[PDB]
Amino acid sequence: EIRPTIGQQMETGDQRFGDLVFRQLAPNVWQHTSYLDMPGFGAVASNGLIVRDGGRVLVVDTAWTDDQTAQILNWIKQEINLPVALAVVTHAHQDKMGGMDALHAAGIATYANALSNQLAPQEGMVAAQHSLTFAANGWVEPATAPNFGPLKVFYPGPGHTSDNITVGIDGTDIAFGGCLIKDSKAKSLGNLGDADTEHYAASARAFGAAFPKASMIVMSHSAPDSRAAITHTARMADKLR
Numbered sequence: 001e002i003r004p005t006i007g008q009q010m011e012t013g014d015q016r017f018g019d020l021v022f023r024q025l026a027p028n029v030w031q032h033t034s035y036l037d038m039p040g041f042g043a044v045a046s047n048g049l050i051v052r053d054g055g056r057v058l059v060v061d062t063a064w065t066d067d068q069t070a071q072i073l074n075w076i077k078q079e080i081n082l083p084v085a086l087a088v089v090t091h092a093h094q095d096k097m098g099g100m101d102a103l104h105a106a107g108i109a110t111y112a113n114a115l116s117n118q119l120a121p122q123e124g125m126v127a128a129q130h131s132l133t134f135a136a137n138g139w140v141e142p143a144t145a146p147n148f149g150p151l152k153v154f155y156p157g158p159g160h161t162s163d164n165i166t167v168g169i170d171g172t173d174i175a176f177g178g179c180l181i182k183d184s185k186a187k188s189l190g191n192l193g194d195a196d197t198e199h200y201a202a203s204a205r206a207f208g209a210a211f212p213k214a215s216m217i218v219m220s221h222s223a224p225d226s227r228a229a230i231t232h233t234a235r236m237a238d239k240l241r
């Protein structure tokens with residue numbers, strides 16, 4: 001088993017599949033986890049989501065690489081055997097967007113914040129094929145998110161990056177904070193190299209307010225947590241200003 005240097009460990013409830021780990025969170029929601037082996041440091045886990053919506057599946061975030069992302073698609077084919085309608089990626093960094101080419105080879109429509117698509121080439125990423133735009137209060141413009149089923153996309157403001165977005169899963173008590181939110185026991189806010197240290201706290205809190213009844217908070221580098229992950233992230237971010 002994979003014991004990452006950074007990221008949650010495997011526990012009861014986890015399925016190893018290839019180089020990845022999958023965990024069912026709800027009857028129709030699974031967390032995908034993939035690992036980047038960094039030289040001299042060991043594996044860094046990154047999480048995203050798989051959502052069944054009737055006869056189709058929706059994905060939030062790629063794995064770190066194209067091969068890992070193809071493995072996600074193979075797990076979905078094995079375990080669910082329904083087509084992937086679209087994927088939403090939550091900002092233009094490798095943990096979230098490093099597998100875009102596997103999605104595109106598979107014929108899956110991809111969506112990202114317009115700003116993530118504008119940044120991606122500068123980051124050595126491939127842009128998603130469609131751009132999401134957002135209102136002044138952070139809610140996605142619904143015409144840019146056609147047929148998203150239960151995915152409710154919200155741009156909370158700059159934080160981990162200027163383009164980070166978040167996704168609520170309607171019909172469940174789950175919301176996904178991506179790299180913006182760290183868990184309730186975290187000692188750090190992770191990589192702040194692209195962060196907006198003035199606005200981070202307010203953006204973390206805005207994500208909480210967008211999904212006020214979400215009780216299970218999913219994030220990129222820890223196991224799903226309570227709402228304390230939001231409040232503790234904001235308290236850590238208050239110290240950056």
Ligand SMILES: Cc1onc(-c2ccccc2)c1C(=O)N[C@H](C(=O)O)[C@@H]1N[C@@H](C(=O)O)C(C)(C)S1
Pocket residue numbers: 006036044092093094095096123124179189190191192220221
């Ligand atoms: C590693 C890693 O190695 N190379 C890239 C990369 C490639 C192209 C563009 C940008 C980065 C990368 C990456 O994606 N790093 C992310 C980042 O910087 O935010 C990861 N999220 C952090 C967080 O959530 O705090 C983290 C400390 C877990 S690291």
Ligand SMILES: [Zn+2]
Pocket residue numbers: 091093160161179
């Ligand atoms: Zn990032």
Ligand SMILES: [Zn+2]
Pocket residue numbers: 095179220221
């Ligand atoms: Zn990250």
